[model samples]
Target: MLTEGISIQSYDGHTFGALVGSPAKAPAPVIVIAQEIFGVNAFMRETVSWLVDQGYAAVCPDLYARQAPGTALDPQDERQREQAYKLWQAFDMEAGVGDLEAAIRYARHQPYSNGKVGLVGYSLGGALAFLVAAKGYVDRAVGYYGVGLEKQLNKVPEVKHPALFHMGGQDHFVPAPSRQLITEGFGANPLLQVHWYEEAGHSFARTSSSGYVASAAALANERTLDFLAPLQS
Candidate 1:
């Protein structure tokens, strides 16, 4: 496997940094990893490595590149959490999805890519993964504990490919009311699947976070890989 830092140019002509990992084999499927609220941090980088080990090329884009390029906040720090919230509040959803789309474009065009692209995201990225899937930018998408999805219900039916979501049953960030709203809103969308981990909370799949639950994370990862397996063929 090979890992390197690369730059991606968004539709608006702005460039952002990204970490890419490719398997030693040629023409592998590529997965674009959308970062959590902390930008392209250690967890996101680790995800890229893991995906490469799974035989899929991975690219993790710096979504905060426009506002704070190369921002990697420590989730354990209160001050950084506050900054993350502030950055979240200020983030432009449309442009952020555009950046993800740019990553998709970059992934599809890469020499090591088989032209099949998948998207996986966490939290903020989870929602972006859904949005990009709605736009039909990828073959598959898996989102972990994605927030703010209730607001994008109109696009639910727009998703044309297989998309999966992992929701924390006890996620305070996405309470039951909102989760119900998303469930009801997305009920009619046959291509989308939502899996609930009752014992987990927000960021449960993030190995570096306190919220990480090994069991739930393992199950979610297994499901995600199963969902993406078709792309590899």
Candidate 2:
């Protein structure tokens, strides 16, 4: 496997850095990973490498490239946690979508890319993944515990590809009412699938996070890999 930093041009023509990882297989399907609010932290890097090991070319774009390029914070640290929230509040999601779209375009043209691309994200990134999936460029998408998705239900019908979302039943961040609205709103779109882990909470899939639950994380990871298996070609 080979991994490196590559410069990606955003839709607005601004350049940003992305961590790219490729497996030994050439022209494999590439997946563009949207970064969480923490911004390409150690976990995000590990995710890119893990995807490469799974035989897919992977890229994690710097979502905070313009405001705080290369920002990586520790969620366990109180100071950093506050910083992360502030960054999240200041983030322009619409612009974030454009940046991710740019990354998707880049993935499609990579030398090691099979011309097929997919998007996956966690937390804030998950919301971006869902938004981008509806744009119809990516081949498939998977979002884990994406917040604020209930407000973007209008775009669900526009998604032409298969999109899977994992929700934590006990997630306080996305309370019952919002979750119900999300599930109900996305119901009309047969192309979308929402899986729920009744015992999980936010960041359940993050191995290093306090909210991590082994069973939920394993199941979600399995489901995610299965959902993405079609892109192996």
Candidate 3:
């Protein structure tokens, strides 16, 4: 069973909105589902549902809510894409980090949540997940083709908790060198595990995207769940 609703509260006396999901059982682990550049669309929703099915109480806050009223993006036009990027660029990582913190608090207070939280992000959200983990905000993090990791490498120190990163070997936006850098940097950390899917691209794990590779995505999802299950235990 699951419950869906919105949360409104004053953090530091500033009001904000966040989405919440509650599973059936008590003391369940929490998973924060971060959206891609396109926001929390159908694909993100599906991912969250999948996490819930895996016995996690998942929450996906609208990180871009302050700048953009809603989480969905219109990707039909090039101009829209450019505007979306501009809006995304205007996003404040500090604010996002705070939102994620609040989300964890909210989950911890839930009747079903065990207070153990993990993060899973894609694209821009992936970068945010890395930032959160680096700051020691979550127990674990999983980043899917975060484009900003390569540039922000220096800012992210050794992560304390376990992390899993997924990259597409053929992803043009991330390329091989960038992926290699991430692999080497995180792999050297001794707390991170990285996986590369040879036949996929940036959004390969997203079933709604054009780059979706069913087999590869399934394998990656299985691997991610297996990595996360024990951590929650």
RMSD of each: 2.0, 1.8, 2.8
Ranking by TM-score: 2, 1, 3
* TM-scores for all predictions: 0.95, 0.96, 0.88
lDDT (tens digit, per residue) of candidate 2 on 59-123: 88888977988788887899998999999999999899999988899999988889889899999
Question: What is the lDDT, from 0 to 100, of the residue 221 in candidate 1?
Answer: 98
Query: Which model is ahead, 1 or 3, in terms of TM-score?
Result: 1
- Model 1 reaches what TM-score against the true structure? 0.95
Candidate 3 matches the true fold with a TM-score of: 0.88
lDDT for 218 (candidate 2): 91
Runs of candidate 2 with Cα error greater than 4 angstroms are: 1-5
lDDT of 2 at 204: 91
Q: Choose 1 or 2, whichever is better by lDDT.
A: 1
- True-vs-predicted CA distance for residue 21, candidate 1, Å: 0.4
In order, candidate lDDTs are 0.89, 0.87, 0.75
lDDT of 3 at 39: 62
Summarize candidate 3's per-residue lDDT along 41-94 as a digit string, tens digits: 666678777887888878887777777656576554577668769878888887
lDDT of 1 by residue, 144-211 (tens): 98887878899988989989999999999788888898888878998999988999999998877888
**TM-score, cand. 2 vs. native:** 0.96
